[PDB]
Amino acid sequence: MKALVEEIDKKTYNPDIYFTSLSRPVKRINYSLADLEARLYT
Amino acid sequence: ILRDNIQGITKPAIRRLARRGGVKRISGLIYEEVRAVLKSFLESVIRDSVTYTEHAKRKTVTSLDVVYALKRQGRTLYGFGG
């Protein structure tokens, strides 16, 4: 059930933000020059 | 033994290692950063040391394993196990 007690770090935890996260996989990277220069110049 | 032995390095020890490097005044985060760099270094070495040991069919790590482990990285540790 719901835990009445919750352990919290002073520096790391904030009540503002709540974040939860878990052949060869590779993150998709765009090789376009105008895309990277467009991202950096905006 | 199995729990948070990276804290075993004392802050005065990092201060003495800073004295060896000629550092006068030291900030706060230096003791954390140097600890993390050591944590990465010991992995980068010990990993290869376990690789050679596993290839040599041994349950015990010797000095030739450490020296030959630092040989391919260009450090070439002399003295023990030369």
Binding site: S23 | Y52, E54, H55, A56, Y68
Partner: protein, 91 residues
């Protein structure tokens, strides 16, 4: 005079991956230099590793552990996977 290169093989693998995009001659020479360099890498590491074990024989074990220690965990993991698959399927 004659010379040896990987050209036809790189073109065949290119047809195995993307049988549309072509390859320039200079990039093909760069790939030839890459494969020729990695050959000396793995071969030399297998020579030193064979010298550390006091053995005059180089087998698939030396290539397996060598490839493991000279490559990142991903490339060594998949390289050992597909390599052992091809060798075990061959023998």
């Amino acid at each position: 005079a004659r010379k040896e290169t990987y050209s036809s093989y790189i073109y065949k693998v290119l047809k195995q991956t993307h049988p549309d995009t072509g390859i320039s001659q200079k990039s093909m020479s760069i790939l030839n230099s890459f494969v020729n360099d990695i050959f000396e890498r793995i071969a030399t590491e297998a020579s030193k590793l064979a010298a550390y074990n006091k053995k005059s024989t180089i087998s698939a074990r030396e290539i397996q552990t060598a490839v493991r220690l000279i490559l990142p965990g991903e490339l060594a993991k998949h390289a050992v996977s597909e390599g052992t698959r091809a060798v075990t399927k061959y023998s």
